[PDB]
Amino acid sequence: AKKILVTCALPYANGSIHLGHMLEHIQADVWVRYQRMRGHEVNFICADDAHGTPIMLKAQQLGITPEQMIGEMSQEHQTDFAGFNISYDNYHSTHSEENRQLSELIYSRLKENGFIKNRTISQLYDRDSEHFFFDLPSFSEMLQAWTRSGALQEQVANKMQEWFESGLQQWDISRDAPYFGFEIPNAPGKYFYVWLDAPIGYMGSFKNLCDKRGDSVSFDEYWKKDSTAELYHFIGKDIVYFHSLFWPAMLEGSNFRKPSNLFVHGYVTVNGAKMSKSRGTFIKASTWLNHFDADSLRYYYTAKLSSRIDDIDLNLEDFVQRVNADIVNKVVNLASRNAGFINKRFDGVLASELADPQLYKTFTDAAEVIGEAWESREFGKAVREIMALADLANRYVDEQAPWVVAKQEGRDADLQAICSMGINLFRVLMTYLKPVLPKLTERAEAFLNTELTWDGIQQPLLGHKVNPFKALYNRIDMRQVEALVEASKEEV
Numbered sequence: 107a108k109k110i111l112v113t114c115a116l117p118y119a120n121g122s123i124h125l126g127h128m129l130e131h132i133q134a135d136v137w138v139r140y141q142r143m144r145g146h147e148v149n150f151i152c153a154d155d156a157h158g159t160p161i162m163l164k165a166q167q168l169g170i171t172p173e174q175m176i177g178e179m180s181q182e183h184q185t186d187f188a189g190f191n192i193s194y195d196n197y198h199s200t201h202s203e204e205n206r207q208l209s210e211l212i213y214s215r216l217k218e219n220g221f222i223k224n225r226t227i228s229q230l231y232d233r234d235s236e237h238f239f240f241d242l243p244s245f246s247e248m249l250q251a252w253t254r255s256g257a258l259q260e261q262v263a264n265k266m267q268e269w270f271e272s273g274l275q276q277w278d279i280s281r282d283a284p285y286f287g288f289e290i291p292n293a294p295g296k297y298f299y300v301w302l303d304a305p306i307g308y309m310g311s312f313k314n315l316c317d318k319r320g321d322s323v324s325f326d327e328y329w330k331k332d333s334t335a336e337l338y339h340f341i342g343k344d345i346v347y348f349h350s351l352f353w354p355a356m357l358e359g360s361n362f363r364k365p366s367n368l369f370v371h372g373y374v375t376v377n378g379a380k381m382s383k384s385r386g387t388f389i390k391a392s393t394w395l396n397h398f399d400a401d402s403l404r405y406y407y408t409a410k411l412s413s414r415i416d417d418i419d420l421n422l423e424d425f426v427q428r429v430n431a432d433i434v435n436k437v438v439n440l441a442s443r444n445a446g447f448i449n450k451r452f453d454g455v456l457a458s459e460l461a462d463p464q465l466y467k468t469f470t471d472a473a474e475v476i477g478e479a480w481e482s483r484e485f486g487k488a489v490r491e492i493m494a495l496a497d498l499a500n501r502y503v504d505e506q507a508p509w510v511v512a513k514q515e516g517r518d519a520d521l522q523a524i525c526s527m528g529i530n531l532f533r534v535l536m537t538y539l540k541p542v543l544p545k546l547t548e549r550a551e552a553f554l555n556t557e558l559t560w561d562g563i564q565q566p567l568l569g570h571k572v573n574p575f576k577a578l579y580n581r582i583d584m585r586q587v588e589a590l591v592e593a594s595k596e597e598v
């Protein structure tokens with residue numbers, strides 16, 4: 107039972123959440139849900155990145171104060187994430203008292219530890235000015251040892267080299283008023299650059315969670331230098347520099363633990379290209395939900411995700427085909443083709459023994475490889491394994507052919523045994539997919555009259571009453587895709 111703290115990058119409070127953002131949150135949520143299923147203590151945290159000149163000026167435009175804009179954006183963002191069932195334990199803000207205090211705490215520890223430097227510069231002004239710099243170069247060797255301690259992704263362990271080929275430099279962490287952010291203590295008119303306080307927002311968000319829980323020990327247990335808890339950050343490749351260099355260094359110099367690992371993913375493309383507004387492929391999370399459910403996109407992204415930083419393509423044509431073929435035709439089909447005979451002919455009661463014990467064992471035997479696949483973030487591998495098992499289950503059902511055994515008077519016991527077998531195979535499959543399809547899983551659990559646990563598959567449902575269900579998952583069609591695209595064009 108490990109203690110794990112997982113985060114997703116903090117979305118900027120200056121735009122709506124789109125399908126690109128959703129790849130990140132969905133990848134993280136699936137991993138998080140899997141970890142909870144295995145019994146670990148998990149804390150999934152996020153928050154809006156609310157500081158920076160851009161935001162300050164955007165607020166001025168709309169005639170709304172930044173405080174007002176970020177407040178509205180925060181609600182919009184959380185409504186969308188909740189719509190995709192992203193299970194955060196806390197969603198906070200970089201513009202909070204918790205983050206203000208932690209930013210000052212870290213800065214003061216850095217300055218006192220001698221990692222903060224001063225200087226002057228020239229810049230366009232609507233001119234000189236003093237600035238504060240973080241002495242990154244002093245943590246190089248430490249970063250080296252940390253970087254090579256068999257942890258980060260190969261493509262990431264490398265990449266940084268191209269950055270070393272340019273040498274680490276002191277980082278300008280201060281900005282002048284007017285600026286929407288935190289004021290630097292003992293330095294009037296100076297503010298912390300957004301990127302300095304942003305990652306501290308991870309800490310601010312957890313502190314908020316602990317404070318709300320009345321938990322006065324967890325914060326330190328997770329962030330103290332000798333913590334045995336694991337810290338993971340899910341991020342895109344465009345912000346790896348901040349998370350692999352500045353961030354670890356800031357923590358090291360302020361007597362805090364560094365991330366256990368960074369899980370970097372690639373960009374989402376639609377129909378093979380970057381999202382395009384004119385083509386209606388720049389899709390908002392809110393818009394997606396007007397047309398499709400969350401499970402469909404969660405499934406599609408998961409079937410294509412891996413432990414690498416490669417781009418993920420949402421091919422709209424392929425989307426409809428994949429969802430109907432896998433979810434409806436393979437998994438859900440296993441339940442619907444068998445539940446009828448059970449509910450109608452046997453009052454919903456499943457057989458008292460497994461018809462084919464060998465087949466069931468083949469299914470539960472796969473838990474190890476599938477669980478390891480979720481754990482290692484090889485989602486595509488996990489899905490292929492699960493769908494391969496599903497093919498086996500549908501083959502079993504065909505060989506046994508219940509639709510024929512049913513019309514043969516005197517074969518009741520045989521029918522119940524066959525159809526119950528299929529229902530139990532379905533139980534196992536939905537357990538492996540539980541991290542991926544939250545809503546379909548709830549519908550399956552209501553039908554099975556059972557909550558699905560990872561260890562529970564070792565005990566099949568016997569002499570057990572199932573409930574009649576009304577379509578667990580309906581097929582989708584290209585006309586809905588066309589409508590989604592058309593709507594997205596019309597929005598911009």
Ligand SMILES: CSCC[C@H](N)COP(=O)(O)OC[C@H]1O[C@@H](N2C=NC3=C(N)NC=NC32)[C@H](O)[C@@H]1O
Binds near residue numbers: 127372373
């Ligand atoms: C302390 S972390 C601070 C992060 C900063 N506010 C960036 O915010 P934002 O630009 O909203 O990006 C949030 C995450 O969304 C990811 N993505 C943004 N557009 C994306 C795609 N098109 N595809 C995949 N991920 C995307 C980014 O890589 C990033 O990790």
